[PDB]
């Protein structure tokens, strides 16, 4: 039955902006002084009311379909393989009935798949959770091109430390300017290998605005970075303003003693997601 739940999950994500993001946009509006950026922000807040009233996607670029799947106890691997097929089918069906734009192509040929399914397109991230019991958690994370095209990696020297991290984050936000459509949400991954650092940077973007890292010391680095990013003056759409970012999320992993990989995933103002927990037949 999962394919139809997946369709309702992509409809949610494509039309209804999470409440923590709408609140952050209302706050951004009351806090800034630039007349240009205040106008841009009310238009965005008006956009979101109209999307919900008329049931159309809030953003025309509905993105590449990314799926985060949490798996509970006492589920057969053969049933997980049927769950992965139903997730593909539900993306095929969502393209049709939401509707989503068909954006997934072959990287060298540019041939459109016409259903966003192909060549490992539904990027499905898998985790195991011993605290769930025949219950899966599905996050739909539709990622736009404008924001993904500003992703960055850097292998710092460990002796660069926290100063070189802050400097790489600021350089990357500054270089991007108005192109990932600010205000923006920054996901920072520190540690692992290069692929893990970028995985972490994306995972950091699943969080709710104001949700600080549960390690108080990193929570403090999140707020130093939000304050310095807001100093840049990029503002809404890179037109100039006081609010460049709504929040900064860091996630960490073990790294090689001789390394310090750092990944950045920018998200545009259209932070879109939808979550559903599903009890399986007994």
């Amino acid at each position: 039955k999962i394919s139809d739940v997946v369709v309702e999950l992509f409809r949610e994500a494509a039309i209804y902006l999470p409440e923590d993001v709408k609140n952050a946009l209302e706050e951004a509006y009351k806090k800034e002084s630039s007349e240009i950026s205040k106008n841009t922000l009310k238009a965005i807040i008006e956009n979101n009311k109209i999307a919900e009233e008329t049931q159309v996607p809030l953003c025309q670029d509905t993105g590449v379909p990314i799926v985060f799947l949490k798996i509970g106890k006492n589920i057969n691997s053969s049933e997980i393989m049927k769950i992965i097929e139903e997730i593909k089918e539900g993306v095929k069906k969502a393209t049709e009935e939401v509707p989503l734009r068909p954006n997934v192509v072959h990287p060298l040929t540019r041939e459109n798949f016409k259903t966003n399914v192909g060549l490992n397109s539904p990027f499905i991230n898998i985790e195991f959770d011993e605290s769930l019991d025949r219950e899966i958690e599905i996050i739909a994370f539709p990622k736009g091109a404008g924001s993904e095209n500003m992703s960055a990696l850097k292998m710092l020297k460990p002796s660069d430390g926290i100063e070189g991290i802050k400097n790489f984050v600021l350089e990357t936000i500054a270089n991007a300017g108005g192109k990932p459509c600010p205000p923006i949400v920054v996901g920072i991954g520190i540690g692992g290998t290069a692929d893990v650092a970028l995985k972490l940077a994306k995972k950091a973007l699943l969080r709710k605005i104001g949700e600080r890292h549960r390690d108080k010391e990193i929570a403090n680095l999140e707020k130093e970075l939000l304050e310095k990013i807001n100093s840049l003056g990029i503002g809404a759409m890179g037109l100039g303003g006081d609010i460049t970012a709504l929040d900064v999320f860091i996630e960490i992993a073990g790294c090689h003693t001789a390394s310090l990989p750092v990944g950045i995933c920018i998200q545009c103002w259209a932070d879109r997601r939808a979550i559903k927990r599903i009890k399986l037949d007994a």
Partner: protein
């Protein structure tokens, strides 16, 4: 200064300094790259367009449309990245004597000479705001080159009401708000890095 026009005469175009707010209530024409290329082929050759772009307003966008009761209904028409037409937009302005381009991100600095010589303004549309701008579309008048280019790449002729707010981001007076913010941003970044 915020303005509201139903039409844009060159006179009015030169009355739009960077940072002005604009709302449109008249006709607009959609064109992405495929459309810009076909339009240039046909005017360079002396083929008659079924529509007139003299002193007109072009919107860089791909409108989503639904056939409902034998008329078209817009669902979402967000703005396209304008810098995709960077290499064809000079030729385009010199063949068509358009008055205004609407889109997002801006366009290369060189074209600011073309916008001063011919009377032309670039207006930034709220990036991402597909539902707002769709709701502004009052009627779909006509669509051109549909069979050839398909629904997004086709030229859609629209009637809009309170299509905005739009920001004047590149003017006919040599100023670009993108170029301005990027220089200030470089300066503030050095003071941190």
């Amino acid at each position: 200064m915020e303005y509201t026009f139903n039409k844009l005469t060159k006179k009015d175009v030169k009355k739009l300094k960077v940072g002005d707010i604009v709302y449109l209530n008249g006709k607009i024409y959609t064109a992405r790259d495929e459309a810009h290329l076909k339009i240039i082929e046909m005017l360079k050759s002396n083929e008659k367009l079924p529509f007139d772009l003299n002193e007109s307003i072009i919107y860089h966008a791909g409108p989503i449309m639904k056939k409902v009761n034998d008329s078209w209904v817009c669902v979402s028409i967000g703005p396209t990245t304008s810098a995709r037409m960077n290499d064809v937009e000079e030729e385009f302005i010199k063949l068509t004597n358009i008055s205004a381009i609407v889109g997002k991100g801006g366009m290369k600095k060189e074209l600011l000479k073309t916008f001063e010589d011919y009377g032309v303004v670039y207006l930034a549309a709220p990036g991402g705001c597909a539902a707002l701008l769709a709701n502004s579309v009052k009627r779909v008048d006509n669509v051109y080159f549909l069979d050839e280019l398909g629904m997004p790449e086709a030229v859609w002729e629209l009637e809009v009401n309170n299509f905005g707010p739009l920001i004047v981001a590149m003017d006919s007076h040599g100023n670009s708000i993108y170029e301005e913010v990027n220089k200030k941003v470089y300066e503030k970044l050095n003071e941190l890095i």
